[PDB]
Every structure is written in structure tokens, then in C-alpha cells.
Design a protein around this ligand. Structure first.
Ligand code: MET
Ligand code: MET
Ligand code: MET
Ligand code: MET
Lengths: 75, 75, 75, 75, 75, 75, 75, 75
């Protein structure tokens, strides 16, 4: 499987709204609101790299509340 | 007790109105518009880390004029 | 001749449409959506540095979906 | 006098519009479009620090086309 | 309790032997070698901020292999 | 009066002793050891910008335990 | 197939000789010495992500002249 | 001709003796010690990019005092 950590910036007053969307997703294993330039860090897992590609470009990046993301694929 | 400094980037031209809004908050002890990568520096004091957590999420991150923050907790 | 790579951050969910627009440009030889702080990596080739200058100002910086770039010129 | 360099990010397709505003200002000594995360770097001079404070918060930061700025005051 | 994610850059080729050391530390809940600007990411859990800062300056910053860290405290 | 905040990085284990030297300077109004990127945040005040330049370049920067400083002048 | 771009920082004066070693690897499709933050930009391809992990951690990162790498996997 | 601005961080307390050296270099058109993340900013002018990269790796990166540079080529 593929494990990845996604750092996210959400629109103001929407970080909780996004967390609630994420915590209902099978791929999300853990999610936290964090201090700093990023609002959240999310740990996700997919069977294949191709599924991760789809998840992030279709589910995450298309979420109206998300303004930016930086994903760190784990070895 | 918790003392922390929050450096923040605000929308160009909104730094002063944002500062006035923050200065009105009890948790805020000092606030200055500054030159550099950051536009505002705010000093806050809260009873607990949890209160600091909530100041960041329920107050700072709900203000659309604030774009990026960096929090440094006194230790 | 000039060869350069432009790494760019785009609005969440716009990376692919931006890429298709760039791929249509003659100066663009390759373009990939990538994981990490950047969302797109583009390889361009122009006759002169001045042409590279104009590609950045008249094309890249006029596209509202592109937010931040970093250009590395081959040497 | 006070000398400072201002790094600026402008709205897409407005960097030239901003340059034209800047090149008509007495305080601007030189201005350039630059590669990178910033669109322009501008060298300004004011008689006093107080005048710089006014110039940047009133003229620069209030310019509708400007999204962010980072000023480096010179010694 | 204090939960935090620490992003680290390590001496090239030393990332794994460093991770082993980290996974040995009780404060470390999970550790991964990652792709991107950072090479490692660990999720730490301490009882107090004091213990967290103490953990970094004693076990993290003391490891020669580790060249740079960025800490995001979870809320 | 010129007010400024200095973010300082000091040689490890010297944070406390450096702060005590700073607290002894009449230019220093506040000094805090903090957690994170920077080791210290210091609030200073001088009558003129000329004095601030001299104070930082001749005193602060000459302190052997201080490695980096990022001064943010206030409006 | 997995395609990725590696941004590399090498010990000064070793950029050219490192590139020639890279160009000799069948995983490497393109390599360029560039101006700026990074010294080299390298395009690589492998059949699986597992192979990429192995290639970067066992070959790339073990090269003595390579100091830092930031790999950006493509979608 | 190629015009570029180089931002540098220097060993604390060495910024001025370093600047003197820079002002001695013919490629250097102006140099200032600045407040902020960077300590120095120089405006360089060379005939070719080749000469610019050569200027940094020969005169800039070779100075021990200089710890970090960021280059913005002017368009
Ligand atoms: C892979 S879609 C755009 C990628 C983005 N930079 C991220 O890592 O989230
Ligand atoms: C001094 S108004 C806001 C300051 C901003 N960070 C700048 O240096 O341009
Ligand atoms: C995979 S070992 C360290 C990886 C490094 N951060 C890179 O992305 O190149
Ligand atoms: C004024 S000497 C170097 C100044 C440093 N960049 C600072 O802002 O603290």
C-alpha cells in the first residue's frame, strides 16, 4: 500500500468543515489541526500509487474549502 | 499560564483593521504592524495551551484577512 | 538557446487545466502535475533569455490559476 | 534618509500596471520585474522612517493590485 | 498531553539508520521516510511542552545526522 | 521612538544566558526564550532608527552566542 | 511506470561529474545543471514506486557528492 | 546584459566587512545591509548568465562569511 501525509491550508473558518469531510473518508487514517502555515496534516493510505493520484486530485484538491496542499509520499 | 507570540501575514491594506480587532480581544496583550515577511506580531496570554489552541482556531483562523501565521510559545 | 524548468503552485483543482493550457504553448516541451510544495513542473525552451522573460510575464503571470513559480535555468 | 527594498506580489496580469504606478512615484528610485515567488523588487527612499511608514501602509499596501509585500529596511 | 509532528532533513543516505533510532524513542509514535523538501516525519507525544522542547534539544537536535527540523504542534 | 522585535537563533544551550545579557540592556523591553525555529524573541526600543542600526550591528550581532537575527521594525 | 523529478544540491564543484554519473543510470531520463537554489534537476523513471524508493534511497542518496535531494513524483 | 539581486545571510557581525568586499567587486552595482530574514542585498550586473553563475560560485559562495544566498534575476 501507499502511505502519505498531506499538509493543507483551508479557507478561513472552514478547517473544521474540511476535517469533518476527511474523517468520513476510508483513505484517511488520522487527521489533525496543526499550528503554523498549514492548518491540517492528514495521513492517508491507498492500495496503489494510482489510487492515491485519483484520491488527491479528485477528492482532496477538488474540495471547495481547500486552498493549497503539499503531499509527502512515504517510502 | 501560557505566553506566546503570533506572527501573521494579512491581506495587503488590512493589517491595521485586523490589529484593532485583535487588540480588542482579552487574550491580546500587544499587537504591532511590522516590516518584513510578516505584517503583524501579536503577544497573547492564556491560562492553558488548550485555550491557546482555541484562540488560534476559533478566532485567528476564522478571520479571512489573516493569511498565514507562525506561533512561538514562550518556554 | 535557453532551457529552463518552471515549478509552479496552482489553485487547488486547477493544476490539470493549467497544464493542458501550457502544453498547448510552443515553448513548452514537457509538463507534469507533481506531489510536493509545487503542483506543476514545466520544461521550456526559448531562443533567448529575453524570450524566457516574456514567456514568464506575458504568459505565466497572466494566468490567475498560477500562484507561485520558481524558475531554474539550465546552465 | 531611509532606504528600503520592497518585494511585491501583484494580481495576475497586473504587475506592469503596478510598475507604471510605482515609476510615477517620487519615493521609488528603481523598480524591476523579477523571477521567483515575488513579481517585483522596488527601491524606495523617504526622508524619515515615519514617511516610509506612511508611504508603505498608505500608498503601497493600499494599491488594489498588490496582494503581498515584504519590505527590507537598509541600515 | 502534547501531540506534535516533526519534519526533518537528514544527511543524505542516513535517513533510515536515523529513523531506527527514532522508533526506539518512546515519545515517537510513528516515523516515516518521506519524499519532498523533508526526509523524515515523526509523530511525537509528550505530557508537556516542556518535555517536547526537551525531547528535541536532547534527542533530536543532538543527532549529528539530523540537519534541520520543523515542528507542527497538533491542536 | 523606534520599536522592533528581534527573532534570534543562538548556539544551543546558550539561550538562557544570552537572554540575561539582553535583559540587562536598556534598549531591551522584553525577551523570551521560545519553542521553534527561533530561540529568542526580543522587543527593543531606541529613540531613532540610527540608534537601532547601531545597537543591532554593534551590540546584538557582535554577541558570540548569537548566530542569526531577524529584526522586524514596527510601524 | 513512475516518473519523478529530483532536485539536487551537490558539494560545490561536483555538479558536472555527478551529472555524468546520473546520465549513466538507466533510471535517469534527463539531467540538467541549473542556476539557483538547486544544482541539478533530474528526471527519472522506474516501473513501480517500490523501485523508485530503492533507487533513490540506495543509489542516489548514497552518492557522496549529493548533499540534499527533493524528489517530486508525477501523477 | 543580465541584472540580478542577490539576498544573503552572513555570519552575525560580519555583514559590513563582507559588504566592503562586495562593493569592491565590479559586478556589484549597489550593496546594502538590510533588516529581515536576509542581512545583505546586492544588485549585480553581468553580460551573461554564465558570468553570473560564475560570479556567485567564484566570489560569493567562496566567501566563508556568506552562509546563504537567494537570487532574483531581473526581467
Ligand atoms: C498531486 S496534486 C498537486 C500536488 C500537491 N503539490 C500536493 O502534494 O498535494
Ligand atoms: C510595514 S506594512 C506590512 C509590512 C510588510 N510585511 C512589508 O514589509 O511590506
Ligand atoms: C526517499 S529518502 C529522502 C527523500 C528526499 N526528501 C527526496 O524527496 O528526494
Ligand atoms: C542590521 S545587521 C543584519 C540584520 C538582520 N537581518 C536582522 O534583521 O536582524
Amino acid at each position: 500500500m501507499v502511505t502519505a501525509f498531506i499538509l493543507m491550508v483551508t479557507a478561513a473558518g472552514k478547517e473544521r468543515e474540511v476535517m469533518e469531510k476527511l474523517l468520513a473518508m476510508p483513505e484517511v487514517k488520522e487527521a489533525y489541526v496543526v499550528y503554523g502555515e498549514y492548518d491540517l496534516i492528514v495521513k492517508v493510505e491507498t492500495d496503489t500509487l494510482k489510487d492515491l493520484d485519483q484520491f488527491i486530485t479528485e477528492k482532496i484538491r477538488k474540495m471547495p474549502e481547500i486552498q493549497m496542499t503539499s503531499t509527502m509520499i512515504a517510502i
